[PDB]
């Protein structure tokens, strides 16, 4: 067993839709290619002893233990490998239930698909499954120590790439509301939405939380001063840094009792709660001074009452919880010694950062605190009344929270909302000490102890003594006020031969509307009028750049099949999905070997259309039109033939189609015909000579019309879009220099070759062509290219791309020569006797093509890179 390739998918993909997280591996079965489990000595027993949990796999039998019966009858090792990977990552607490295995075109390689919850964990499980199965086939069993090591590694991977409970809850709420979310790679920030409608959170702070408010909240004395200036009842306190100032400060606060705390503290280090005389105040001051990082200590009046935590989101009180410190009640005539561990044996209590209820830690400090209680370990509580173990009233110690949201006085709600607004925090956690939260803070001597930025609401979503509160819902309401997601219109263009031109035309048409359009094509990624990134940029790695840009209002993404195969789609859904055509030209790449497979792959864009979206399909293409079903949302057809029966039937019942009827680009809205242009005033059609460009214009116009774009905007965009070097790099770029003309193009497959010929054959001058193709294509494609070039052209110069993609140098050139020779031999008389010659250099090929161009001739160039031809024709004027 050798792993040849390991790919991970993060969006809708070839293998499944709504199963975005998948991993696919090319597994080589060098020796066990046709070796069933029933034929392997001791395989079944060793496998079922290593992992007894496989009995829960309801396989194709559909009954408990069906996979075990499948192994009994004899099954290929790829199936058991996928099942053991699923179970291996399932044992680590990660539920996954999708798996597929298919035979590839090559003899010995399988393709195994595993659903994952964590990318690293999924890849690790996929790598470990083959090792486990190889060990089982070699020795009959797998060591238990290696199994435990692998599960511990999987658990570590799951824990490492895990969000915290606050971020997890917020993300779950966003997913429930259908708001897209992605993880930024900088500071554990989560981005909600797309483009100009995006928001960001880290854990609880949003992108709208102010620096000034957070910094003020972090400052205890500044916050107290600000709240006191606003009339908020803060505790009466004073700062002190030297021993001598203590007596004067205690005189100022108003007597006894008092509180001694440090200015800066974490987990309440060195904070005393209640002291009533001199010496204890002295030692508390010493402890706080040695606990503070700046030697300075707060001294304030002590206020009796329970400690409440109030959560304010968007200036509204969302949850109120009373923090009762760790305690035990002897209502069952039992003392502390039994209840300390009786509570610890409750399943609710747990450690870590997931379970709020922590075990009652009987620390030496806790022993001292219960010493100050006035009772002992075996001292039975009187009457069955609460007896406490600590006074910090925190969940980390082992305390409990009581929901008080329904009992807070409205005046208190108003005061706390004012406090949150005064500090300047959209989300704030306010600590209140009061005897009764149901009465105003003025009647009782309630005080505001502190204001917390980025508070943890974990205690409010699981109070354990009241009703849970939907804090994540409140946060999402703040981030997205109405019934609005963060989505921007997404237009995904897929197809075999016209993705780039259609994408650029759509971008231009939408640019006619006053909107910033971010679009990625084969040439590069553009935002507005400026280039944002160079290169290929036809995959999700470039779609993320557009979707995360804060200025993009509409996204038009050219979705090549390569990106879908490699990692799926970069988005969950699209507003418009355009499928132009599916032609079997570059077969054999990946697992795609038949045109049905290619159609299934390209149908991902059509099937990803949201229910309120539109799918623009070519009615003239039978395979594309076959995607009419299994598509959620409306369907729109475009056809170059106005008499298409399917299109007419679709328009009769409904509408939303586009045709080219009598020299017009027209939109059919049912029984109404809306003409856009004469198709001779559209520059890219070149007076209607190029029919494929007319089809691209039809698709683009239909796509923009389905979104409500005005007819005048479509008209202006179609009229002002040019097919020259200023806008189109090499898409039907015609250059005039007087003596002849040069037509540089991007044709590399038989379908685009036929489309190019359908326009070149109309030229009345000499036809010179430099043709070629990528080296990763099949030989039959090269033969077809050669014969088509023989059919359409009069002078042939064959060139092979410098980046040959692993193919031996030259081979494609002589095979295109074989194709042109076959076409030449297929002609009886001198009907078409085009001359042929082959040179393997791009510069030499274009130089020879431009050197021998006669008067009024046409020279067609199909270079590896458009910039080479552009520069070469720019230098020669």
């Amino acid at each position: 067993m050798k792993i040849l390739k390991l790919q991970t998918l993060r969006g809708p993909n070839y293998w499944s839709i709504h199963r975005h997280k998948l991993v696919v591996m090319r597994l080589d079965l060098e020796d066990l290619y046709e070796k069933y489990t029933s034929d392997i000595p001791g395989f079944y027993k060793g496998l079922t002893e290593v992992l007894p949990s496989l009995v829960e796999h309801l396989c194709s039998p559909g009954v408990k233990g069906g996979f075990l019966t499948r192994v009994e009858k004899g099954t290929l090792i790829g199936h058991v490998i996928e099942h053991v990977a699923i179970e291996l990552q399932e044992l680590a607490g990660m539920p996954v239930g999708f798996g597929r295995t298919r035979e590839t075109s090559t003899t010995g390689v399988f393709q195994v698909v595993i659903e994952y919850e964590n990318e690293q964990a999924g890849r690790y499980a996929a790598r470990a499954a083959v090792r486990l199965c190889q060990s089982i086939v070699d020795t009959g069993t797998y060591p238990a120590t290696e199994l435990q090591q692998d599960l511990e590694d999987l658990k570590e991977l799951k824990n490492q790439a895990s969000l915290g409970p606050s971020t997890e809850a917020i993300v779950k709420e966003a997913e429930a509301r259908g708001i897209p979310w992605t993880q930024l790679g900088a500071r554990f920030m989560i981005q909600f939405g797309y483009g100009v409608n995006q928001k960001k959170i880290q854990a609880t702070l949003s992108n709208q939380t102010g620096i000034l408010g957070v910094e003020l909240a972090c400052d205890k004395e500044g916050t107290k001063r600000i709240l006191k200036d606003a009339g908020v009842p803060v505790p009466r306190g004073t700062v002190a840094r030297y021993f001598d100032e203590l007596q004067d400060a205690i005189e100022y606060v108003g007597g006894y009792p008092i509180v001694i705390k440090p200015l800066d503290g974490n987990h309440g280090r060195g904070i005393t709660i209640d002291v009533k005389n001199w010496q204890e105040a002295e030692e508390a001051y010493d402890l706080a001074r040695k606990a503070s990082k700046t030697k300075t200590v707060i001294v304030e009046r002590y206020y009796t009452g329970k400690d409440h935590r109030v959560l304010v989101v968007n200036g509204k009180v969302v949850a109120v919880a009373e923090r009762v410190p760790a305690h035990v009640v002897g209502n069952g005539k039992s003392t502390i010694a039994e209840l300390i561990e009786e509570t610890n044996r409750d399943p609710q209590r747990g450690d870590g950062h997931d379970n709020i209820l922590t075990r009652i830690t009987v620390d030496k400090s806790a022993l001292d605190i219960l010493g100050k209680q006035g009772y002992s370990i075996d001292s039975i509580p009187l009457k069955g009344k609460k007896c406490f173990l600590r006074a910090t009233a925190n969940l980390s110690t082992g305390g409990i929270a009581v929901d008080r949201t329904d009992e807070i006085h409205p005046e208190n709600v108003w005061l706390l909302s004012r406090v949150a607004k005064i500090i300047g925090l959209d989300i704030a956690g306010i600590d209140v000490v009061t005897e009764d939260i149901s009465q105003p803070l003025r009647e009782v001597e309630g005080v505001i102890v502190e204001v917390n930025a980025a508070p943890g609401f974990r205690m409010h979503v699981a109070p354990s003594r009241g009703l849970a509160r939907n804090v994540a819902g409140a946060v999402m309401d703040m981030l997205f006020p109405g019934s609005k997601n963060g989505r921007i219109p997404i237009l995904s263009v897929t197809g075999t031969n016209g993705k780039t031109t259609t994408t650029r035309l759509l971008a231009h048409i939408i640019k006619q509307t006053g909107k910033v359009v971010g679009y990625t094509t084969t040439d590069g990624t553009y935002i507005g009028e400026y280039l944002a990134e160079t290169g290929d940029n036809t995959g999700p790695q470039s779609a993320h750049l557009i979707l995360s840009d804060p200025t993009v209002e509409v996204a038009v993404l050219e979705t090549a099949r390569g990106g879908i195969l490699r990692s799926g789609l970069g988005f969950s859904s699209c507003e418009v999905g355009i499928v132009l055509n599916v032609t079997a030209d570059h077969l054999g790449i990946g697992d795609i070997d038949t045109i049905e497979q290619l159609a299934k792959l390209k149908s991902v864009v059509a099937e990803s259309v949201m229910p309120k979206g539109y799918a623009v399909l070519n009615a003239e293409d039978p395979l594309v039109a076959a995607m009419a079903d299994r598509v959620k949302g409306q369907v729109a057809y475009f056809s170059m033939d106005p008499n298409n029966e399917l299109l007419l039937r679709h328009t009769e019942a409904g509408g939303l189609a586009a045709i080219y009827e009598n020299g017009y680009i027209s939109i059919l809205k049912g029984d109404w015909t809306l003409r856009i242009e004469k198709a001779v005033n559209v520059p890219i059609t070149m007076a209607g000579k190029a029919p494929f460009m007319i089809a691209n214009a039809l698709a683009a116009c239909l796509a923009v019309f389905t979104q409500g774009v005005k007819i005048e905007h479509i008209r202006k965009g179609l009229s002002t879009f040019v097919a020259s070097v200023d806008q189109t790099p090499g898409r039907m770029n015609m250059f005039n220099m007087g003596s002849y003309h040069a037509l540089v193009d991007y044709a590399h497959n038989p379908a685009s070759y036929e489309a190019l010929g359908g326009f070149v054959r109309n030229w009345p001058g000499k036809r010179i062509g430099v043709v070629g193709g990528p080296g990763d294509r099949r030989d039959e494609d090269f033969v077809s290219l050669g014969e088509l070039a023989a059919d359409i052209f009069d002078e042939i110069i064959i060139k092979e791309d410098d980046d040959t993609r692993g193919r031996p140098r030259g081979n494609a050139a002589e095979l295109i020569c074989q194709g042109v020779k076959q076409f030449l031999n297929g002609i009886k008389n001198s009907e078409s006797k085009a001359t042929y010659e082959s040179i393997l250099d791009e510069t030499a090929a274009i130089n020879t093509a431009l050197d021998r161009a006669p008067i009024d001739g046409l020279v067609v160039i199909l270079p590896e890179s458009v910039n080479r031809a552009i520069s070469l024709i720019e230098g020669r004027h």
């Binding site: 606050s166 854990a203 609880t204 974490n266 917390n452 930025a453 980025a454 943890g456 974990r458």
Partner: peptide, 4 residues
């Protein structure tokens, strides 16, 4: 720190 981190969720105060």
């Amino acid at each position: 720190d981190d969720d105060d």
